[PDB]
Amino acid sequence: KPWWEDEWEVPRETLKLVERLGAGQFGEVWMGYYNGHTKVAVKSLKQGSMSPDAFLAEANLMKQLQHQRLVRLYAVVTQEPIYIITEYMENGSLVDFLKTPSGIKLTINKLLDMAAQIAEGMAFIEERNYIHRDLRAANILVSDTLSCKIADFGLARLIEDNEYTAREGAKFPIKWTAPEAINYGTFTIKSDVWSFGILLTEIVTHGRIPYPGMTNPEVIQNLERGYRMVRPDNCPEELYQLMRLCWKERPEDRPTFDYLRSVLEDFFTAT
Ligand SMILES: CC(C)(C)n1[nH+]c(-c2ccc(Cl)cc2)c2c(N)ncnc21
């Protein structure tokens, strides 16, 4: 709907930007307050760095994916500089949070709980016919109560028919991306499941880079031989066998996110 009839447009005066949390080529991310009392995250577009329409597509996607386990869109300011205002996650990125003194002291029980929260969020995404395509610990946000939410929906896509095929020059992080997506540009919810397998290694190693000691060409070569990532240090064998299900050669053999959530909750309720 036009911005004047939109439930999301908001006068820029309602916002006060307080602390820059991040900055890059396409903009910045700040902690701020909406109408004085409500803490929010504000992502601002660096004018000219990219299309305003491309930037706002992320917000438009978040409008269609609302759930307690996904970072919530709050508002948008569609005049330059363009802003996307969302739910503020106090403990920031999971990949960074796991490295802090609080994250380091987490028991395997709580790491499993978090893994299950993520699978829960991905099961909602899966049910809505969407895919994420950038599922990795960097893209999981942590709340002040240590609950986890899926974030960074920029590459998310509604799957009309079974699969989304990227553009021929599109590049993806090799270590987190399913082989079919790397070799063919082909993404399905099963590609996200592969990524989730990789995300579980990030969780159990407190944020270490997947495939320790290997370059991308080595990872590709090992995968093509039928090998998968070596068991991470201190990883419980039950969890490692769950990651192996996520890495099944055929996409169709990989489990659903609902199956994963359910097994992960059992693992948690036992430890
Ligand atoms: C990068 C980091 C960890 C500083 N970060 N990034 C976002 C975020 C905000 C708006 C959009 Cl549209 C997408 C992500 C964010 C947030 N909500 N809460 C806490 N930290 C956040």
UniProtKB/Swiss-Prot annotation:
Phenotypic consequence of K46R: Abolishes UBR2-mediated 'Lys-63'-linked ubiquitination. Abolishes UBR2-mediated 'Lys-63'-linked ubiquitination and autophosphorylation of Tyr-164
Report the GO molecular function annotations: ATP binding; ATPase binding; CD4 receptor binding; CD8 receptor binding; identical protein binding; non-membrane spanning protein tyrosine kinase activity; phosphatidylinositol 3-kinase binding; phospholipase activator activity
Kindly report the protein's main subcellular placement as a broad class: membrane
What mutagenesis or variant effect is reported for P217L?
Found in leukemia
The keyword Lipoprotein appears for this protein: yes
Q: Top EC class per UniProt?
A: transferase
Q: Does the keyword Repeat apply?
A: no
In what way is its activity controlled? The relative activities of the inhibitory tyrosine-protein kinase CSK and the activating tyrosine-protein phosphatase PTPRC/CD45 determine the level of LCK activity. These interactions allow rapid and efficient activation of LCK in response to TCR stimulation.
Its membrane topology is listed as: Lipid-anchor
Q: Which reaction does it catalyse?
A: L-tyrosyl-[protein] + ATP = O-phospho-L-tyrosyl-[protein] + ADP + H(+)
Residues annotated as signal peptide: none
Disorder named in the UniProt entry: A chromosomal aberration involving LCK is found in leukemias. Translocation t(1;7)(p34;q34) with TCRB. Immunodeficiency 22: A primary immunodeficiency characterized by T-cell dysfunction. Affected individuals present with lymphopenia, recurrent infections, severe diarrhea, and failure to thrive.
Name the UniProt record assigns to this protein: Tyrosine-protein kinase Lck
Organism of origin: Homo sapiens (Human)
The primary gene name is LCK
What part of the entire protein does this chain span?
Answer: 231 to 501 of 509
